[PDB]
Every structure is written in structure tokens, then in C-alpha cells.
Design a binder for this molecule. Structure first.
Ligand SMILES: NC(=O)c1ccc[n+]([C@@H]2O[C@H](COP(=O)([O-])OP(=O)(O)OC[C@H]3O[C@@H](n4cnc5c(N)ncnc54)[C@H](O)[C@@H]3O)[C@@H](O)[C@H]2O)c1
Ligand SMILES: NC(=O)c1ccc[n+]([C@@H]2O[C@H](COP(=O)([O-])OP(=O)(O)OC[C@H]3O[C@@H](n4cnc5c(N)ncnc54)[C@H](O)[C@@H]3O)[C@@H](O)[C@H]2O)c1
Lengths: 333, 333
């Protein structure tokens, strides 16, 4: 129902757009990217190296992008305040360039005549929501919001289930992270974090991740009880989370399997998956879950100290959660 | 002897700098990069993911980069005309940003007080030299020159030897090319060539290459008798050239081995290598040859139609040829 605009036709822009048509839960009506011409948008959307060719039709027609006959207005504005979202009928705007992630910078879209803005990335100040965890806390007073880190979306559902059933005393998260577009193939220059500037093909690269601190925001009971770090490795797609955590109430590893499977079939259906199959990363390519619990891969030392493993498709799962969130926002309109 | 400045501390900047100290044939006295602070230069120079830690000492000391006690003036100028090369004593300037590759744009360095400029990349108009092939054609009248494509440096020495001994009627070159910094890990945006914008980890990517046309410039007899294309593949370093070519004078494949080995031991020593060992790409990591002929890997259909294979370290070989060229220019001063 709700008409949506997308600022930035990157991996996220394009895959959010894919999810919109794939699910039909919202309607893309407008796209802004100053660094991509319309003809190139057709190419970049149609062919995905990782998710394969688009299941549908896409063509350029009289300066509009036409996906399954649905025509889409294109803008080429460097400055977000000058996008005429209102004119094109864009109610909600997905901010997916990841350079306007503050309340202040993201707000520019409201000038164009957007009603609401969803930042497809963590925000320093804008409120963060993770579907299945704290999305019920959205109300219509919020004009600008964030859908958090892809990693945060994987970790929070699992964390919720564990904290609800046994209570997390304290936890430490490692994510093994497939490669992002903020990384380099060889070269050198990367202003602020030096490790991220190293060649991504060749090595395992440590990296920071506020994803653990951020779960503390969406599940406020867990505030300051989690932190973590990341290793970037050269797989094209699909990442994994390793939550090492202390429980207050004892839990045989079989009990943890039960409550997680239970949640996957019930309140967190389609968000938290569960599997006992002997899976590997690429088995999750184009999986729409936020988080899939690997029962086999996890290990427990005792009934109060366990390592839980959860797979997530960094691109596809999050992309679908952005759409799912907007759909929910539109229901509460 | 000659004092040298380097514009741009990229893969090429840094490895040219390495070769300067490693061989001691020139002396780096100045470095300009506006996008890298001095402390980060230390990091990026010291550690190479591919060639390993620098065999020597490097530290920042009072705003200077100090490599083996040799201190180096740092500049932070976006605009090349405003670099005070003369002040820092930089006689020759290595233009290694690859965005000032025209006579016109590269000329800016002369304003700073550089005497000569060497473009570490093909140029549209500036004269190109390949060591061992046409470097004798340099004279002091030339203020701005190019050291050609890394690929051109691999192809030309081989081509010379073959054309000198048997004559190339016509040839077609394929290069399988390790990844460059003009490629992407996943993302999307790449203005002009769409294929180069695709994910470099995941796939084999066709790409254009004027390297074959360019050999026609350095060996003028071969003008318009070669062309080719490239495939980019996800290896960190080391590329290979596949020259398919028609000979006018008959040549058993054993004759070709003989004349190439001969050249490698004699007039093209240290530029053209020869090997019969059953080698692979990574066996050429940090090899300083412009081109190493794989005797085993090549194949011949008949005495007039053969496929010749030659390995080159895209970074290290070329870096060393830049230094070797400047050294020669300085001898002719
Ligand atoms: N898998 C993931 O990468 C992942 C998962 C979760 C969250 N995120 C977050 O989502 C963000 C989006 O990154 P991406 O994956 O799309 O990479 P990307 O490089 O493909 O995306 C950037 C796109 O936006 C365009 N753009 C840049 N500046 C712009 C401007 N001022 N106006 C309009 N368009 C502009 C660029 O041309 C490019 O097409 C990141 O900040 C990241 O934190 C990413
Ligand atoms: N192996 C190879 O990549 C190879 C081989 C042969 C030739 N070449 C050629 O050499 C060139 C250099 O590329 P690279 O490999 O160093 O990649 P790179 O991205 O690491 O190099 C660019 C460097 O120059 C800096 N820079 C950019 N603009 C600048 C400016 N205006 N002033 C000063 N510094 C600036 C950047 O910060 C960066 O450090 C390319 O044009 C390429 O055609 C490359």
C-alpha cells in the first residue's frame, strides 16, 4: 500500500527494491542516485553476482525505471533536501547511502516532502528498531528511524530468546563477516581504520562493531551486558555470529535448542530460523531470515556458559526487514 | 644519484619507493598524498599484504617520513601545480596517482619545479618507454614521459624477441589479470565500464586493454598488428599474458625456446625471464622481471601459429622498471 522512495541504489538500495517487488508489501515509486545513470540502474538491478538475475522484467522507458510494468521516477541529486519526493508520491524514504545516518542529515528528505524516513543503517541518535524484538515500540510520533546493523538484526532475536528464557548475565560477540563495500580489494587508502584499508581477498581483517552495544538499546534490559568485535573474511556473502554468554538460570544445550526452535515456529517465525542440518555459509544465500540458529555448530562448557552460532545473509535478510518494518509503520498510520 | 619525488602513495607509489631503497639506484626525497596522513604512510609502506614487511626501518620523525634514516618531505596537495617539488630538491617526479596521465595534466609538476615527470601508467599523448625495448630512444628534450601499462611491459619484451627472430604477421593477446584497485569487492557503482563494477571476488570479469595497441607504439614495426582483451580474476597478485600470433619465418617451438632463453641471458637480462619449471602464478610473487616466459605452458599448432605464455608480477616488475628508467634518464642527463 505505502508508496516508497529509495535514496541510493547500492547493494542495499537495490536489494530493498528487490524485496519490495518480491513480496509486494510496499510499492517503490522513486529512486535517487546521483552517481548512476538510468541505463546503468537497469544493469545493476537486473544482474546480481550473488542472488542471480531478477525474477521478473526491468527496462528503462522514457526516463523512468520500469520493474514489472511499475514505472519509477529517477532523481540525480547529490543534496538530499533537493529531492522532490512529494512530487513523485514517495510517502516513506529509505535512506540507504549510509552517509546520512544522523537525525539531522537524514531529515533533509522531509524537505522534499517525505512523510517518514527509514535509515537502513545504525544511527547515532535516531531510534533503532529490530523486527520481532522491539518493533511494537514504534509509534506515529517518530518521523525518522533506523533499522539497525545487519549484524544487530541477527544478534538481537537470538539474544531476546535466550535472555527471556534463561537471562544473559554478560556476553561477548564475535562476528565473522563476509565482505562489505566499505572494504578494499588491494590498494591502501582508508582514512580512519587502517585494517579496513588492507586487501580483503588476502586476509582475515579485524573490525569494530557497535552491534553488541546496540542490542543493549533495542533490548534495554541487556544494556551494557554485551560487547564484541568482528573479523572480515573473503566470502562474497553470508556472515555468522558467535555469541559467548553467561546465563543466570541453568540451561542444558538441549533446553536452548528447544526454546529457540519454539520461537522460530511461533513468535519469531520468518525472523529467527532454526536448523540442525550440517550447514555451511553458502547454504544461507538469499535466506530471508534475520538470523538462523545453527544447533550443531554451537558448544556449551557448562549449564551457565555457552557459545551460540547464528547465520545471517547480510544483504537479503536485512533488506527484507527494512520492507517488513515500513509495512508495519504503514499499518500503524 | 638523481633525487626523486612521488605523487601518490598508492600500490605503485609505495612499491616504486620500495624499489628505490631496495636497489639504491635513485633517492626518494619527497612524497605527496593529500588523502593519507604521515602516520598512516608509515603503516601502509611498512606492511604489504602481498610482498611482506619492509626489509629495513621506517618511522615518522618531525613531519618527515624516515626510511633507513633517509628523511622524506611530505606534501598534502590536491592540486599538482602547488607541490613545491623544487624546494624539497625533487629533480624527477613519479606521477603515480593515475589521474594525471596526459602531457597537459602531468605538466603541473613542472610548476612546482620538477625538471622531469615520469607517468607510471599509459598516457594518451606523452611518449611511452619500455625498458629493454625502446628506452634507448629517450633523449633529454623529453620533459614528460610514460613507462606504459604493466601488461605492456610484459608483452613488449616477448614480442620484440619473437618479431626480431621470426616476425609477427599478426597477433591476438589475452591477459589473465590479478585484481587492481580500479575494481570492486561487491557494491555496484563504476561510471563507464559496467563489468568492472561487478564483484571481483566472485567472478571472472572481461576488461579492455590498450596494451596490445601500445606495443605497436614502442615497437613501431608491429603497429596495428596486435590487439587483445583481458579477464580480471580474484588472485591477489601476478598476472599472465597469452600471445597468440602468426609468424612469417617458420619456428619449431624448440627454436622459440632457444631465442627467448638467449635473450633472457643476454640483451634482456633482468627484464625477460625464462623458465621450464612447472610453475604457477604465486611462484612469481615479488619477481622483478618485466616478463617471464613459461616454456612448458605455451603451445604451438604448427610452425607459423603459436601461443606463448608469459608471467608478470603486475606490481613489483613495473615498479622496478620505473626506477630503472629514471636511473637511465639520469645517465643521459
Ligand atoms: N550487507 C550490507 O552491506 C549491510 C547490511 C546492513 C546494513 N548496512 C548499511 O547500509 C548502508 C548502505 O551501503 P550499500 O551496501 O548500499 O553499499 P554501496 O556502495 O553499494 O551503496 C552506496 C550507494 O549510494 C550511492 N550514494 C552515495 N552518496 C549518495 C548521496 N549523497 N545521495 C544519493 N545516493 C548516494 C552510491 O552511488 C551507491 O550506489 C551502509 O551504511 C551499511 O552500514 C549494510
Ligand atoms: N599493478 C598495478 O596496479 C599497475 C601496474 C602498472 C601500471 N599501473 C598504473 O598505475 C596507476 C596507479 O594506481 P595504484 O596501483 O597506485 O592504486 P591506488 O589506489 O593505491 O593509487 C592511488 C593513490 O594516489 C592517491 N591520489 C589520488 N589522487 C591524488 C592527487 N590528485 N594527488 C596526489 N595523490 C593522489 C590516492 O590516495 C592513492 O593513495 C594506475 O593508473 C594504473 O594504470 C598499475
Amino acid at each position: 500500500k505505502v508508496k516508497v522512495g529509495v535514496n541510493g541504489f547500492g547493494r542495499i538500495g537495490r536489494l530493498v527494491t528487490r524485496a519490495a517487488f518480491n513480496s509486494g508489501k510496499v510499492d517503490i515509486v522513486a529512486i535517487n542516485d546521483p552517481f548512476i545513470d538510468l541505463n546503468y540502474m537497469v544493469y545493476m538491478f537486473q544482474y546480481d553476482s550473488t542472488h542471480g538475475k531478477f525474477h521478473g522484467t526491468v527496462k528503462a522507458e522514457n526516463g523512468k525505471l520500469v520493474i514489472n510494468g511499475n514505472p519509477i521516477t529517477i532523481f540525480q541529486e547529490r543534496d538530499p533536501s533537493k529531492i522532490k519526493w512529494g512530487d513523485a508520491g514517495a510517502e516513506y524514504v529509505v535512506e540507504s547511502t549510509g552517509v546520512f545516518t544522523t537525525m539531522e542529515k537524514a531529515g533533509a528528505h522531509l524537505q522534499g516532502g517525505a512523510k517518514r524516513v527509514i535509515i537502513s543503517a545504525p544511527s547515532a541518535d535516531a531510534p533503532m528498531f529490530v523486527m520481532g524484538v522491539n518493533h511494537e515500540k514504534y509509534d506515529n510520533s517518530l518521523k525518522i528511524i533506523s533499522n539497525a546493523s545487519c549484524t544487530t538484526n541477527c544478534l538481537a532475536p537470538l539474544a531476546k530468546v535466550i535472555h527471556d528464557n534463561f537471562g544473559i548475565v554478560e556476553g561477548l560477540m564475535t562476528t565473522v563477516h563476509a565482505i562489505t563495500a566499505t572494504q578494499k580489494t588491494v590498494d591502501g587508502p582508508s582514512g580512519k581504520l587502517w585494517r579496513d584499508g588492507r586487501g580483503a581477498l588476502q586476509n582475515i581483517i579485524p573490525a569494530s562493531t557497535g552491534a553488541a552495544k546496540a542490542v543493549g538499546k533495542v533490548i534495554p534490559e541487556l544494556n551494557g551486558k554485551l560487547t564484541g568485535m568482528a573479523f572480515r573474511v573473503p566470502t562474497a556473502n553470508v556472515s555468522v555470529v558467535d555469541l559467548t554468554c553467561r546465563l543466570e538460570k541453568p540451561a542444558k544445550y538441549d533446553d536452548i535448542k528447544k526454546v529457540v526452535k519454539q520461537a522460530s515456529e511461533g513468535p519469531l517465525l520468518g525472523i529467527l530460523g532454526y536448523t540442525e542440518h550440517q550447514v555451511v555459509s553458502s547454504d544461507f544465500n538469499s535466506d530471508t531470515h534475520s538470523s538462523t540458529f545453527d544447533a550443531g555448530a554451537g558448544i556449551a562448557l557448562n549449564d551457565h556458559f555457552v557459545k551460540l552460532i547464528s547465520w545471517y545473509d547480510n544483504e537479503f535478510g536485512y533488506s527484507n526487514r527494512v520492507v517488513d518494518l515500513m509495512a508495519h509503520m504503514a499499518s500503524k498510520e
